[PDB]
Design a protein around this motif. Structure first.
Motif, PDB file in Angstrom:
ATOM      1  N   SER B  44      39.861 -15.965 -45.709  1.00  0.00           N
ATOM      2  CA  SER B  44      40.091 -14.963 -44.684  1.00  0.00           C
ATOM      3  C   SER B  44      40.574 -15.664 -43.427  1.00  0.00           C
ATOM      4  O   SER B  44      39.941 -16.615 -42.961  1.00  0.00           O
ATOM      5  CB  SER B  44      38.823 -14.168 -44.401  1.00  0.00           C
ATOM      6  N   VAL B  45      41.693 -15.202 -42.890  1.00  0.00           N
ATOM      7  CA  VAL B  45      42.325 -15.854 -41.751  1.00  0.00           C
ATOM      8  C   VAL B  45      41.556 -15.526 -40.478  1.00  0.00           C
ATOM      9  O   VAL B  45      41.190 -14.372 -40.237  1.00  0.00           O
ATOM     10  CB  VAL B  45      43.807 -15.452 -41.669  1.00  0.00           C
ATOM     11  N   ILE B  46      41.241 -16.555 -39.693  1.00  0.00           N
ATOM     12  CA  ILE B  46      40.597 -16.396 -38.396  1.00  0.00           C
ATOM     13  C   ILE B  46      41.508 -17.012 -37.348  1.00  0.00           C
ATOM     14  O   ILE B  46      42.181 -18.011 -37.620  1.00  0.00           O
ATOM     15  CB  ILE B  46      39.181 -17.020 -38.377  1.00  0.00           C
ATOM     16  N   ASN B  47      41.567 -16.410 -36.161  1.00  0.00           N
ATOM     17  CA  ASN B  47      42.489 -16.892 -35.145  1.00  0.00           C
ATOM     18  C   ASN B  47      41.760 -17.403 -33.908  1.00  0.00           C
ATOM     19  O   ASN B  47      40.646 -16.980 -33.593  1.00  0.00           O
ATOM     20  CB  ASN B  47      43.526 -15.826 -34.737  1.00  0.00           C
ATOM     21  N   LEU B  48      42.406 -18.335 -33.224  1.00  0.00           N
ATOM     22  CA  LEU B  48      42.018 -18.743 -31.890  1.00  0.00           C
ATOM     23  C   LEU B  48      42.783 -17.918 -30.872  1.00  0.00           C
ATOM     24  O   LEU B  48      43.552 -17.020 -31.211  1.00  0.00           O
ATOM     25  CB  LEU B  48      42.266 -20.235 -31.680  1.00  0.00           C
ATOM     26  N   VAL B  49      42.568 -18.230 -29.602  1.00  0.00           N
ATOM     27  CA  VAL B  49      43.301 -17.614 -28.511  1.00  0.00           C
ATOM     28  C   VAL B  49      44.169 -18.676 -27.853  1.00  0.00           C
ATOM     29  O   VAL B  49      43.720 -19.806 -27.623  1.00  0.00           O
ATOM     30  CB  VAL B  49      42.356 -16.932 -27.507  1.00  0.00           C
ATOM     31  N   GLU B 105      43.507  -5.320 -32.128  1.00  0.00           N
ATOM     32  CA  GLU B 105      43.548  -6.764 -32.263  1.00  0.00           C
ATOM     33  C   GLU B 105      44.988  -7.245 -32.233  1.00  0.00           C
ATOM     34  O   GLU B 105      45.857  -6.692 -32.907  1.00  0.00           O
ATOM     35  CB  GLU B 105      42.889  -7.197 -33.568  1.00  0.00           C
ATOM     36  N   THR B 106      45.238  -8.291 -31.455  1.00  0.00           N
ATOM     37  CA  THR B 106      46.602  -8.731 -31.217  1.00  0.00           C
ATOM     38  C   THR B 106      46.771 -10.180 -31.639  1.00  0.00           C
ATOM     39  O   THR B 106      45.804 -10.924 -31.805  1.00  0.00           O
ATOM     40  CB  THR B 106      46.993  -8.560 -29.751  1.00  0.00           C
ATOM     41  N   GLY B 107      48.029 -10.575 -31.800  1.00  0.00           N
ATOM     42  CA  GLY B 107      48.375 -11.919 -32.214  1.00  0.00           C
ATOM     43  C   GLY B 107      49.069 -11.969 -33.559  1.00  0.00           C
ATOM     44  O   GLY B 107      48.419 -11.940 -34.601  1.00  0.00           O
ATOM     45  N   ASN B 135      56.932 -14.197 -43.954  1.00  0.00           N
ATOM     46  CA  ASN B 135      56.855 -12.876 -43.338  1.00  0.00           C
ATOM     47  C   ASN B 135      56.225 -13.024 -41.961  1.00  0.00           C
ATOM     48  O   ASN B 135      55.029 -13.294 -41.851  1.00  0.00           O
ATOM     49  CB  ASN B 135      56.065 -11.906 -44.196  1.00  0.00           C
ATOM     50  N   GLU B 136      57.035 -12.865 -40.924  1.00  0.00           N
ATOM     51  CA  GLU B 136      56.496 -12.521 -39.625  1.00  0.00           C
ATOM     52  C   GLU B 136      55.795 -11.174 -39.749  1.00  0.00           C
ATOM     53  O   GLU B 136      56.248 -10.286 -40.473  1.00  0.00           O
ATOM     54  CB  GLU B 136      57.607 -12.448 -38.569  1.00  0.00           C
ATOM     55  N   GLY B 137      54.672 -11.028 -39.060  1.00  0.00           N
ATOM     56  CA  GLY B 137      53.947  -9.784 -39.109  1.00  0.00           C
ATOM     57  C   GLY B 137      52.880  -9.658 -38.045  1.00  0.00           C
ATOM     58  O   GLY B 137      52.302 -10.645 -37.594  1.00  0.00           O
ATOM     59  N   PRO B 138      52.603  -8.434 -37.621  1.00  0.00           N
ATOM     60  CA  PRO B 138      51.495  -8.196 -36.720  1.00  0.00           C
ATOM     61  C   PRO B 138      50.186  -8.303 -37.475  1.00  0.00           C
ATOM     62  O   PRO B 138      50.167  -8.153 -38.703  1.00  0.00           O
ATOM     63  CB  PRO B 138      51.746  -6.764 -36.241  1.00  0.00           C
ATOM     64  N   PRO B 139      49.065  -8.539 -36.791  1.00  0.00           N
ATOM     65  CA  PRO B 139      47.804  -8.753 -37.506  1.00  0.00           C
ATOM     66  C   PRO B 139      47.145  -7.489 -38.014  1.00  0.00           C
ATOM     67  O   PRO B 139      45.996  -7.559 -38.450  1.00  0.00           O
ATOM     68  CB  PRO B 139      46.926  -9.419 -36.452  1.00  0.00           C
ATOM     69  N   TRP B 140      47.800  -6.338 -37.968  1.00  0.00           N
ATOM     70  CA  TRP B 140      47.195  -5.098 -38.427  1.00  0.00           C
ATOM     71  C   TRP B 140      48.019  -4.374 -39.476  1.00  0.00           C
ATOM     72  O   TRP B 140      47.746  -3.205 -39.751  1.00  0.00           O
ATOM     73  CB  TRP B 140      46.922  -4.172 -37.242  1.00  0.00           C
ATOM     74  N   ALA B 141      49.007  -5.021 -40.075  1.00  0.00           N
ATOM     75  CA  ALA B 141      49.826  -4.381 -41.092  1.00  0.00           C
ATOM     76  C   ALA B 141      49.989  -5.309 -42.281  1.00  0.00           C
ATOM     77  O   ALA B 141      50.126  -6.520 -42.113  1.00  0.00           O
ATOM     78  CB  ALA B 141      51.189  -4.004 -40.544  1.00  0.00           C
ATOM     79  N   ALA B 175      49.561 -19.165 -40.822  1.00  0.00           N
ATOM     80  CA  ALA B 175      49.249 -19.602 -39.471  1.00  0.00           C
ATOM     81  C   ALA B 175      49.276 -18.425 -38.512  1.00  0.00           C
ATOM     82  O   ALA B 175      49.867 -17.382 -38.794  1.00  0.00           O
ATOM     83  CB  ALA B 175      50.225 -20.671 -38.999  1.00  0.00           C
ATOM     84  N   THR B 176      48.613 -18.612 -37.370  1.00  0.00           N
ATOM     85  CA  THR B 176      48.604 -17.659 -36.270  1.00  0.00           C
ATOM     86  C   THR B 176      49.061 -18.376 -35.010  1.00  0.00           C
ATOM     87  O   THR B 176      48.803 -19.567 -34.843  1.00  0.00           O
ATOM     88  CB  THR B 176      47.218 -17.100 -36.002  1.00  0.00           C
ATOM     89  N   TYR B 177      49.719 -17.652 -34.101  1.00  0.00           N
ATOM     90  CA  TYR B 177      50.176 -18.339 -32.898  1.00  0.00           C
ATOM     91  C   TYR B 177      50.014 -17.516 -31.632  1.00  0.00           C
ATOM     92  O   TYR B 177      50.653 -17.812 -30.619  1.00  0.00           O
ATOM     93  CB  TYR B 177      51.627 -18.801 -33.033  1.00  0.00           C
ATOM     94  N   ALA B 178      49.157 -16.508 -31.648  1.00  0.00           N
ATOM     95  CA  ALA B 178      48.873 -15.757 -30.436  1.00  0.00           C
ATOM     96  C   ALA B 178      47.444 -15.250 -30.538  1.00  0.00           C
ATOM     97  O   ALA B 178      46.643 -15.775 -31.316  1.00  0.00           O
ATOM     98  CB  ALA B 178      49.900 -14.634 -30.238  1.00  0.00           C
ATOM     99  N   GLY B 179      47.113 -14.242 -29.749  1.00  0.00           N
ATOM    100  CA  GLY B 179      45.778 -13.672 -29.774  1.00  0.00           C
ATOM    101  C   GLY B 179      45.198 -13.759 -28.378  1.00  0.00           C
ATOM    102  O   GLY B 179      45.659 -14.531 -27.536  1.00  0.00           O
ATOM    103  N   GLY B 180      44.162 -12.961 -28.125  1.00  0.00           N
ATOM    104  CA  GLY B 180      43.527 -12.115 -29.114  1.00  0.00           C
ATOM    105  C   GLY B 180      42.028 -12.237 -29.001  1.00  0.00           C
ATOM    106  O   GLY B 180      41.444 -11.909 -27.974  1.00  0.00           O
ATOM    107  N   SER B 181      41.404 -12.717 -30.065  1.00  0.00           N
ATOM    108  CA  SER B 181      39.969 -12.919 -30.080  1.00  0.00           C
ATOM    109  C   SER B 181      39.684 -14.102 -30.991  1.00  0.00           C
ATOM    110  O   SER B 181      40.584 -14.883 -31.311  1.00  0.00           O
ATOM    111  CB  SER B 181      39.249 -11.641 -30.533  1.00  0.00           C
TER     112      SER B 181
END
Ligand code: CA
Ligand code: CA
Ligand code: CA
Ligand code: CA
Lengths: 326, 326, 295, 295
Positions: B44-49, B105-107, B135-141, B175-181
């Motif tokens: 499960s992917v977890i993100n930093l800010v 939730e953003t990022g 795939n570029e994608g928002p974290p809610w789709a 990978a993630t590159y924005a956020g968020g929480s």
């Protein structure tokens, strides 16, 4: 092509032996059940002279060919893929004995099937003959037995399950009661078709046994060993195997002062370094080694020690290139 | 059923999420090749800010989702039955990302496939965007990628095989590159169909790594760990995992005086007793424990010691009821 | 000659954590503990009050549902799975549960079912004696959760079954008898309402909390030196009666009737202090609200 | 542009023991060592004298046969099998080899074949450098025996192949260069005639024996204190030439031409004594019988 006279008679040759090929396993699925048929060997029967003996040793260690896909001592390719399922059913299974000695070897052998798995492996010569499925036979002619199947599904032995009798198709054995010499005679092939159902995350393939002066047998995992290991107080921590193959072990003892494990002078050969440390209150020694059979005295480790409290081992099967610092 | 006005427009709900079922695996044989299709998750992917980060840690440990049926970190049910074969071929494989957070939730996240397996896992934000399959994608789709297959058969990693690049279908990452929480966002499912050929005796499932101050990396077995373990001279023998699950370990060190392993205060929880002995020139300590993820400081064992020469571990996967004297 | 009931009842709540992997709402997972069997009082809560009056059963059809309780903005993954033998070990990472043949995941804001296949054989109900407890069960159920982002109750799970009992035995009751001392644990007897976790040593330490819902009647005796009164307030479960109590020199006996919701928190349910203690006993029955000790 | 030879030659003998399990005529099994590859001089014995003049190959069809040599009264089981990657570990018990997909057992008094499947891809011949040596081979062959009842040579095995070489390289030769010291082992160079087993320390200890058949030409230098003459008699292999020798104070150089049959026994082939030694070198070539040092 032509036997010399007379004609229409019974002729005894010097040797007869079938030639076998290593056929591949073959899979088949049907209604969510995976069906696999294969043939492999189990062991080679060796005989003594003038003494009744069963399954190549005299203690005979009840079980030890417990017919179950988790048993590594009988099936050698099945259990590493049968640990992905929780139920099985044999659809067809027979044990084939093929000779490899000359006609001049004597001592009539037999092999048989029992339905439960704690009948304590008979000692009288007459008690061998009266099993419901058997073959009396001379040691130079091929003999096969079928063993009857059911429709009942059983479990594939992932836990301790101390009443290990409802989850087994039975028990296989063989014995010799005359002779002869002290040579190999033949080897037993088993060909079999199984089913599996209800796939599973892969269980462990590692045995953990414990032993103090008391309860024997507080074990788990697949029985690479069984309760055959001697310790009382004295120069007494003896481990010996019967299952073939090569293994990775790790030992831990307790008590008074100890000595180094003297593996030399018995069954099984070193392959690595066996680092050892301890000698005050407890000691650890791991190793990795291969062994072949076999029943003999001065067993495979003879860890001496002085005064001991507990001992416990962990056993796992592993290939050659896994040893220590070579 | 009816969204409020206006009509024919784009509407953004609070959350969207598919509901999934745990479908069984299904087998099929064809011309001596066994074909198996299944679906399971990986992580499960977890993100930093405010920080770029790839595969849930910052060191990112090149490989670690190396797409190969022997890899336990990606497939969790496949490798315990893929150790019975020596060749494979993927016939169809896709990675499915399903969200589990709210719309607030953003990022924007991404997941991608590379063809080799030593490209060192990019750090620039722009270098992520230019992979051939992503795939570029928002974290809610939800976003899915296919990954192209071949006809070439490869090997299923039973040995050290140090150029571990010709035997792999590629490498998966995200990978993630924005956020968020600092919450979980979604989890990645992989559904796949494989083949196998040329059945084999069951190889080992036990890793053996070595480490002194030098050559890193003289290892063997399936990479439950990789070269991420710190020791130089000082209070320095640090082991931390990333692969989930529960394991049986056995350690052995060398050098000057040592201390006890202080596993408390980090990832992974005890389950048994961990007997320990030593403190003069070498020491042994085994244990058994479960761990979950995860990337954090003060790693999972911090064996201190005083002055060290070598260290070497053995790792194997095992269930719960295998611990020491409970 | 064979009765046949059909019912849909409660099992337990679910509680997620901040980004780890937990099975059946604890760490270390307590092997077994949801073996599906009509005498297992830890998962059924209306069934085993009549399964004590029989000996055999056969589940004719059984499904497990999961209804949501949380807001739709909360992340999570809940999952439901079933192994067909009762003491294969539970998984430890989230990667393992994709391999179970009967699984169904889903977000914590939507409903989720799964069936579990039955078979036409009959088993036994009694589990105080069968070691191994493996052929007397139809399987083992477990749920798991793996995401953030809170520590709140985010749903519960319900069964929907059909049973066939036969050849009744006499009703012995549903009482427990939980002894305990500073040493070996714990020698239970009866159903499994509660639990091999009740902390007490010698200090201000005699703690019992529950994890199953429902309304209960408990009696308890203690031993040792001076015992303080049970201050039940502050934790889970609310008093409904009078809470009589006596003693405080060598032993203290006290009865209570209450109900608890099960979900947990810190500062557990009863928490007697005492001064220096030896042993403790508990008898736990399930009974309704009219049978309260009046004031 | 692609040559295509077809030939049937010798591999090695077989030797059984009194009731154990041995693979490729030794204990500890020497992982690899029969990787089937036209430069592997340890299994082919006519092929690699022309595979040194090429770079690529493709086996178009290959089978291994086993002809008997012993009397029909001798018990035994011989077996032939093939794993398709070169460094999976060899088995250690007789129960394992039933699981190989391409196997064929049989009694030691009857003939036994097995095929081994090929594929239409081309590989390389050079193996001094490829670590790993895994994609440059078509597989790995091994035999095993498991019964009594003697220690005699009870047969041998023959190949029957068809190759396709392409894009020749220049012939460097077939010589070896085996250095050795009292320490690290062994830094070979060339083909693998012989072997990482040649015992020598400082005492009456400079031993070399072979295990491949054929006629050979060897040169050797030694170092250290006083060296005695090589007494080749008593072991395997017979002298065919003159055996010139010189030295005995700091070094001693000696050439020999001989042939050995390979089968082994005690008291190995050359066995120089010496007094105190440092290092030794060996160059081994395969050459016929006319090139003998005349007297
Ligand atoms: Ca099981
Ligand atoms: Ca392999
Ligand atoms: Ca009854
Ligand atoms: Ca060249």
């Amino acid at each position: 092509n032509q036997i010399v006279g007379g004609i229409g008679a019974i002729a005894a040759p010097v040797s007869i032996t079938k030639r076998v090929r290593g056929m591949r396993p073959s899979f088949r699925q049907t209604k969510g059940k995976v069906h696999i048929v294969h043939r492999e060997l189990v062991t080679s029967v060796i005989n003594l002279v003038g003494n009744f003996r069963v399954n190549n040793n005299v203690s005979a260690q009840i079980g030890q060919f417990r017919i179950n896909p988790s048993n590594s001592s009988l099936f050698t390719w099945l259990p590493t893929i049968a640990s992905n399922f929780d139920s099985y059913r044999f659809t067809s299974i027979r044990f084939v004995y093929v000779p490899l000695c000359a006609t001049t070897e004597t001592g009539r052998v037999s092999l048989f099937w029992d339905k439960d798995s704690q009948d304590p492996l008979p000692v009288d010569r007459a008690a061998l003959s009266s099993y419901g499925h058997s073959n009396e036979g001379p040691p130079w002619a091929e003999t096969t037995l079928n063993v009857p199947t059911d429709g009942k599904q059983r479990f594939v032995t992932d836990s301790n399950t101390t009443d290990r009798k409802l989850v087994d198709l039975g028990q296989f054995a063989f014995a010799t009661y005359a002779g002869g010499s002290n040579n190999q005679i033949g080897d037993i092939y088993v060909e079999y078709g199984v089913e599996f159902s209800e796939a599973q995350p892969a269980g462990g393939l590692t045995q953990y046994i414990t032993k103090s002066v008391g309860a024997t047998a507080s074990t788990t995992g697949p029985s690479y060993v069984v309760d055959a290991n001697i310790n009382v107080n004295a120069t007494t921590a003896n481990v010996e195997f019967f299952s073939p193959g090569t293994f990775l072990i790790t030992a831990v003892v307790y008590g008074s002062t100890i000595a180094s494990p003297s593996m030399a002078g018995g069954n099984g050969t070193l392959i690595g370094d066996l680092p050892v440390v301890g000698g005050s209150n407890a000691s650890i020694w791991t190793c990795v080694f291969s062994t072949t059979g076999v029943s003999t005295s001065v067993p495979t480790f003879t860890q001496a020690g002085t005064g001991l409290t507990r001992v416990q081992y962990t056993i796992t099967r592993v290939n050659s290139q896994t040893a220590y610092q070579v």
